[PDB]
Enzyme design. Structure first.
Site, PDB file in Angstrom:
ATOM      1  N   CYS A  15      31.869  39.273  46.875  1.00  0.00           N
ATOM      2  CA  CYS A  15      30.640  39.468  47.629  1.00  0.00           C
ATOM      3  C   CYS A  15      29.849  38.185  47.720  1.00  0.00           C
ATOM      4  O   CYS A  15      29.593  37.535  46.707  1.00  0.00           O
ATOM      5  CB  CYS A  15      29.778  40.574  47.024  1.00  0.00           C
ATOM      6  SG  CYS A  15      28.486  41.199  48.163  1.00  0.00           S
ATOM      7  N   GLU A  34      31.959  39.606  59.753  1.00  0.00           N
ATOM      8  CA  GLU A  34      32.686  40.813  59.365  1.00  0.00           C
ATOM      9  C   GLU A  34      33.081  41.621  60.582  1.00  0.00           C
ATOM     10  O   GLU A  34      34.181  42.163  60.641  1.00  0.00           O
ATOM     11  CB  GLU A  34      31.859  41.683  58.423  1.00  0.00           C
ATOM     12  CG  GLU A  34      31.535  41.051  57.073  1.00  0.00           C
ATOM     13  CD  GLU A  34      30.846  42.018  56.125  1.00  0.00           C
ATOM     14  OE1 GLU A  34      31.381  43.123  55.904  1.00  0.00           O
ATOM     15  OE2 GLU A  34      29.765  41.674  55.590  1.00  0.00           O
ATOM     16  N   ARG A  63      25.558  38.431  46.819  1.00  0.00           N
ATOM     17  CA  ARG A  63      25.148  38.760  45.459  1.00  0.00           C
ATOM     18  C   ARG A  63      23.745  38.388  45.024  1.00  0.00           C
ATOM     19  O   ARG A  63      23.260  38.890  44.012  1.00  0.00           O
ATOM     20  CB  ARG A  63      26.171  38.238  44.457  1.00  0.00           C
ATOM     21  CG  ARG A  63      27.376  39.141  44.324  1.00  0.00           C
ATOM     22  CD  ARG A  63      28.224  38.769  43.146  1.00  0.00           C
ATOM     23  NE  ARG A  63      29.333  37.892  43.500  1.00  0.00           N
ATOM     24  CZ  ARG A  63      29.857  36.990  42.676  1.00  0.00           C
ATOM     25  NH1 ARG A  63      29.373  36.843  41.449  1.00  0.00           N
ATOM     26  NH2 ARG A  63      30.852  36.221  43.078  1.00  0.00           N
ATOM     27  N   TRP A  68      24.076  44.965  53.842  1.00  0.00           N
ATOM     28  CA  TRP A  68      23.923  44.879  55.285  1.00  0.00           C
ATOM     29  C   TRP A  68      25.087  44.007  55.707  1.00  0.00           C
ATOM     30  O   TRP A  68      25.710  43.352  54.872  1.00  0.00           O
ATOM     31  CB  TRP A  68      22.586  44.274  55.700  1.00  0.00           C
ATOM     32  CG  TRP A  68      22.198  43.076  54.932  1.00  0.00           C
ATOM     33  CD1 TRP A  68      22.748  41.841  55.019  1.00  0.00           C
ATOM     34  CD2 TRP A  68      21.155  42.995  53.954  1.00  0.00           C
ATOM     35  NE1 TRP A  68      22.114  40.987  54.155  1.00  0.00           N
ATOM     36  CE2 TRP A  68      21.141  41.664  53.491  1.00  0.00           C
ATOM     37  CE3 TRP A  68      20.247  43.917  53.424  1.00  0.00           C
ATOM     38  CZ2 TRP A  68      20.228  41.233  52.513  1.00  0.00           C
ATOM     39  CZ3 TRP A  68      19.345  43.487  52.457  1.00  0.00           C
ATOM     40  CH2 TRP A  68      19.346  42.154  52.007  1.00  0.00           C
TER      41      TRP A  68
HETATM   42  C1  HEM Z   1      22.910  42.982  50.538  1.00  0.00           C
HETATM   43  C2  HEM Z   1      23.957  42.720  51.430  1.00  0.00           C
HETATM   44  C3  HEM Z   1      25.245  42.296  51.204  1.00  0.00           C
HETATM   45  C4  HEM Z   1      25.916  41.371  51.912  1.00  0.00           C
HETATM   46  C5  HEM Z   1      25.441  40.251  52.880  1.00  0.00           C
HETATM   47  C6  HEM Z   1      27.289  41.583  51.454  1.00  0.00           C
HETATM   48  C7  HEM Z   1      28.358  40.946  51.887  1.00  0.00           C
HETATM   49  C8  HEM Z   1      29.711  40.960  51.496  1.00  0.00           C
HETATM   50  C9  HEM Z   1      30.794  40.516  52.367  1.00  0.00           C
HETATM   51  C10 HEM Z   1      30.649  39.534  53.517  1.00  0.00           C
HETATM   52  C11 HEM Z   1      31.965  40.933  51.777  1.00  0.00           C
HETATM   53  C12 HEM Z   1      33.343  40.717  52.248  1.00  0.00           C
HETATM   54  C13 HEM Z   1      33.701  42.062  52.852  1.00  0.00           C
HETATM   55  C14 HEM Z   1      35.037  42.009  53.552  1.00  0.00           C
HETATM   56  O1  HEM Z   1      35.442  40.880  53.872  1.00  0.00           O
HETATM   57  O2  HEM Z   1      35.690  43.059  53.771  1.00  0.00           O
HETATM   58  C15 HEM Z   1      31.566  41.609  50.560  1.00  0.00           C
HETATM   59  C16 HEM Z   1      32.400  42.303  49.687  1.00  0.00           C
HETATM   60  C17 HEM Z   1      32.081  43.174  48.579  1.00  0.00           C
HETATM   61  N1  HEM Z   1      30.791  43.484  48.286  1.00  0.00           N
HETATM   62 FE1  HEM Z   1      29.225  42.745  49.282  1.00  0.00          FE
HETATM   63  N2  HEM Z   1      27.438  42.507  50.519  1.00  0.00           N
HETATM   64  C18 HEM Z   1      26.223  43.000  50.357  1.00  0.00           C
HETATM   65  C19 HEM Z   1      25.950  44.060  49.548  1.00  0.00           C
HETATM   66  C20 HEM Z   1      26.837  44.614  48.640  1.00  0.00           C
HETATM   67  C21 HEM Z   1      26.413  45.776  47.679  1.00  0.00           C
HETATM   68  C22 HEM Z   1      25.066  46.561  47.850  1.00  0.00           C
HETATM   69  C23 HEM Z   1      27.437  45.886  46.644  1.00  0.00           C
HETATM   70  C24 HEM Z   1      27.547  46.709  45.394  1.00  0.00           C
HETATM   71  C25 HEM Z   1      26.404  47.428  44.937  1.00  0.00           C
HETATM   72  C26 HEM Z   1      28.443  44.806  47.170  1.00  0.00           C
HETATM   73  C27 HEM Z   1      29.696  44.875  46.600  1.00  0.00           C
HETATM   74  C28 HEM Z   1      30.834  44.249  47.141  1.00  0.00           C
HETATM   75  C29 HEM Z   1      32.270  44.422  46.682  1.00  0.00           C
HETATM   76  C30 HEM Z   1      32.875  44.908  45.344  1.00  0.00           C
HETATM   77  C31 HEM Z   1      32.987  43.767  47.600  1.00  0.00           C
HETATM   78  C32 HEM Z   1      34.440  43.610  47.701  1.00  0.00           C
HETATM   79  C33 HEM Z   1      34.772  44.643  48.753  1.00  0.00           C
HETATM   80  C34 HEM Z   1      36.240  44.694  48.998  1.00  0.00           C
HETATM   81  O3  HEM Z   1      36.949  43.870  48.390  1.00  0.00           O
HETATM   82  O4  HEM Z   1      36.704  45.533  49.799  1.00  0.00           O
HETATM   83  N3  HEM Z   1      28.053  44.114  48.302  1.00  0.00           N
HETATM   84  N4  HEM Z   1      30.232  41.588  50.423  1.00  0.00           N
HETATM   85  N1  LIG Z   2      28.086  43.783  53.901  1.00  0.00           N
HETATM   86  C1  LIG Z   2      28.926  44.561  53.185  1.00  0.00           C
HETATM   87  N2  LIG Z   2      28.487  45.256  52.195  1.00  0.00           N
HETATM   88  N3  LIG Z   2      30.192  44.648  53.553  1.00  0.00           N
HETATM   89  C2  LIG Z   2      31.119  45.510  52.881  1.00  0.00           C
HETATM   90  C3  LIG Z   2      32.398  45.522  53.597  1.00  0.00           C
HETATM   91  C4  LIG Z   2      32.234  46.031  55.049  1.00  0.00           C
HETATM   92  C5  LIG Z   2      33.551  45.905  55.865  1.00  0.00           C
HETATM   93  N4  LIG Z   2      33.932  44.459  55.936  1.00  0.00           N
HETATM   94  C6  LIG Z   2      33.347  46.389  57.298  1.00  0.00           C
HETATM   95  O1  LIG Z   2      33.639  45.591  58.183  1.00  0.00           O
HETATM   96  O2  LIG Z   2      33.004  47.561  57.507  1.00  0.00           O
END
Ligand code: HEM
Ligand SMILES: NC(=[NH2+])NCCC[C@H](N)C(=O)O
Ligand code: HEM
Ligand SMILES: C[C@H](O)[C@H](O)[C@H]1CNc2nc(N)[nH]c(=O)c2N1
Ligand SMILES: C[C@H](O)[C@H](O)[C@H]1CNc2nc(N)[nH]c(=O)c2N1
Ligand SMILES: NC(=[NH2+])NCCC[C@H](N)C(=O)O
Lengths: 360, 360
Positions: free
Chosen positions: A65, A240, A68, A235
């Site tokens: 993520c 993405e 973070r 968000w």
């Molecule tokens: C506040 C906004 C946030 C942004 C900008 C964001 C953004 C991102 C993005 C860009 C990815 C890559 C997703 C992909 O490529 O499929 C990611 C992955 C991930 N995020 Fe975030 N995220 C946010 C909030 C969250 C929240 C609220 C949680 C947990 C409470 C979180 C947990 C994770 C996890 C574990 C992954 C890995 C997902 C996977 O491998 O399928 N994120 N995040």
């Molecule tokens: N901003 C995030 N929390 N992204 C979580 C993964 C979302 C996923 N990459 C989608 O295209 O639906």
């Protein structure tokens, strides 16, 4: 050995949890109560506080993520009281409403009851609460959703067969052999039709995407306790959608159609039309969502914010972990600080893990 | 133990080498002659053939090279006969001429004498035969060349202090405490002034880059033998220049100036001007080099060609190794097949390795 592992994880978590909360004195007492509980029942119950922070810590440790930095602002919704499918459905409907927040998305997470004797209390099938259905003869919709769509059709669901059919919520309650589905109320789901600020013809593509990416197929492990059902949401980040969801060949694959409407040729690779199409597509995404008042973030602001994160973990004496391969935006990787630095891809609990899919 | 390691590497190499060449019967005889030679002298001498293929194999095993498909077409120039600085200089001057080939670059490699008792016969200081000098007060030239530039100035060299000063060839012969330098003859070096096909104002940036990337600071290890001096060259891939060399903040950093000439604002990240600048810059690079008849390749054709490579290694029963983090172009990573597949980043000899820099 399961009663042994649980205790060990529990020890490390409680200590680390309370130290962060500044309640180091309450560690001994709590651990004793937990010990008895693991004997008495075979497991233990987190306090609203422990679990809330446990879920926030789990975010902070999510190597992939990039968002973070707002880890401590996560809105935790404790629904460990749900007993019926009606309770789950309402819970889920609520997560979408509270998260959506009229466009001002709220990074949220609904904590459903954890696994007992390794058995699941609630089992969500959806990859994401909101996701489009995918079909085949020729590709209709999201290919990535093929497997699940068929699973829903095997249970009585039927899509209008458009490129953007909203899949129903699907889950299984402990005791039931099969899961039950529920169609999503159109008024609850926010969608954003994609348009371009300078190119008026971009609307002929008739593209769109939902506003909130709520990941529902991951297990939140917090100190030995496995919460297989704990939907979370942040968000979106422009790429993405504009680079992966819509441009991937295995996804919507609109690069050529996009290149067509921007008046450029697709004749030669040396003209770098794919690259130009990608950029224009992503400008459209960021502009659409913003025009509609739905929260989104670009990869630069995101990298910028993540950098601040890196500094704050340091300033707090916490080792930083991350997956380089997943952290760099698929668009202009080397234009962000993340591309020019290495990361320690080590697993640290609490965290979020993938789990075997019920269908397929 | 050095006499033991050498033998072991030698065994594996000769066998693997001859099997590929279809000369499996000559393995026993050759290995025996090699054994005696390691006793007699303490090391051994590769045959023009062995070494040629050893250098080609080393390319094929270069995890970070995306242009590995032409591995068997490498033009090996054996200069293990050089004894003087004049011999080295001429050798080097020749590599540039033969490689350059009037624009039709030839992936070449000059094999200089290997290390004897761990001591170097020839020691090239340059990172690349052709490279621009870098200075500081405010940034003039290539920042990446700061360290070496000062090292050259400590030996009597002096640059005109422009952003594109050509560094002299610098090396040290065994027996000499310090290295000697030699200025490069302007007629030998091909440069390409950058321009844009649709934007006539792009020339106000007064950008340019040399035509051949000849990496000279890597050791070619072929069966226990260490060839610290073995300059190799391929042709460029647009992004190497347009995305890294010219756009990196720590390099020439022209994104803003570029964004300025393309008539776009640098006000907001959400407009994705950096991305737009990158694309336009890379279209310019590919177009410039091509207009001038100098070989270059875009990241898509490169990925496409590398994919063919992946298939040919398979069709030859050879495991494929690669570094994902280095294989994906810094521009539109997810638009290539490389982004959607994982690679085994394991070291396999013969190969090319970094080595401690003499200066710094
Ligand atoms: C506040 C906004 C946030 C942004 C900008 C964001 C953004 C991102 C993005 C860009 C990815 C890559 C997703 C992909 O490529 O499929 C990611 C992955 C991930 N995020 Fe975030 N995220 C946010 C909030 C969250 C929240 C609220 C949680 C947990 C409470 C979180 C947990 C994770 C996890 C574990 C992954 C890995 C997902 C996977 O491998 O399928 N994120 N995040
Ligand atoms: N901003 C995030 N929390 N992204 C979580 C993964 C979302 C996923 N990459 C989608 O295209 O639906
Ligand atoms: C025929 C044209 C070739 C193309 C298109 C090509 C392309 C590439 C590119 C894009 C890189 C990444 C460079 C960087 O990011 O700094 C790379 C790295 C590398 N290439 Fe190639 N290359 C070619 C020829 C060669 C040759 C002739 C050899 C050896 C005989 C080779 C050996 C290597 C090695 C070991 C690296 C890693 C360099 C480093 O890590 O600094 N390549 N290649
Ligand atoms: C496993 C997958 O095919 C691919 O290697 C990765 C790498 N980088 C990624 N990066 C992000 N952010 N999201 C992804 O889906 C992937 N997929
Ligand atoms: C070590 C360096 O800062 C960075 O992590 C890497 C990653 N990817 C790269 N990829 C290529 N092709 N070339 C590079 O210089 C780098 N640098
Ligand atoms: N095509 C190649 N052989 N590249 C080798 C590395 C060249 C180096 N990236 C440069 O910018 O000078």
């Amino acid at each position: 050995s399961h009663a042994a592992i649980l205790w060990n994880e529990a020890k490390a978590f409680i200590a680390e949890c309370y130290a962060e909360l500044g309640k180091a004195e309450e560690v001994a007492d709590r651990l004793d109560s937990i010990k008895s509980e693991i004997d008495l029942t075979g497991s233990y119950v987190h306090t609203k506080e422990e679990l809330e922070h446990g879920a926030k810590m789990a975010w902070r440790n999510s190597n992939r993520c990039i968002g973070r930095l707002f880890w401590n602002s996560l809105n935790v919704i404790d629904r460990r009281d749900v007993r019926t499918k009606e309770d789950v459905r309402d819970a889920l409907f609520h997560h979408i409403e509270t998260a959506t927040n009229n466009g001002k998305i709220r990074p949220s997470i609904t904590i459903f009851p954890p696994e007992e004797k390794g058995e699941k209390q609630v089992e969500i099938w959806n990859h994401q609460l909101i996701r489009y259905a995918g079909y085949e003869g020729e590709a209709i919709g999201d290919p990535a959703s093929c497997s699940l769509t068929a699973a829903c059709e095997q249970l009585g669901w039927r899509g209008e067969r458009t490129d953007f059919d909203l899949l129903p919520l699907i889950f299984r309650m402990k005791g039931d052999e099969q899961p039950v589905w529920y169609e999503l109320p159109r008024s609850l789901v926010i969608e954003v039709p994609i348009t371009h600020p300078d190119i008026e013809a971009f609307s002929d593509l008739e593209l769109k995407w939902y506003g909130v990416p709520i990941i529902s197929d991951m297990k939140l492990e917090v100190g030995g306790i496995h919460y297989n059902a704990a939907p979370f949401n942040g968000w979106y980040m422009g790429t993405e959608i504009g680079a992966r969801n819509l441009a991937d060949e295995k996804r919507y694959d609109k690069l050529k159609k996009v290149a067509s409407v921007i008046g450029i040729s697709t004749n030669y690779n040396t003209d770098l039309w794919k690259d130009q199409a990608l950029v224009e597509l992503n400008k459209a995404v960021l502009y659409s969502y913003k025009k509609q008042g739905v929260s989104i973030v670009d990869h630069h602001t995101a990298a910028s914010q993540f950098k601040r994160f890196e500094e704050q973990e340091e300033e707090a004496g916490r080792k930083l972990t991350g997956d380089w391969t997943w952290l760099i935006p698929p668009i202009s990787g080397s234009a962000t600080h993340i591309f020019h630095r290495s990361y320690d891809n080590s697993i640290v609990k609490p965290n979020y893990f993938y789990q075997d899919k019920p269908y397929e």
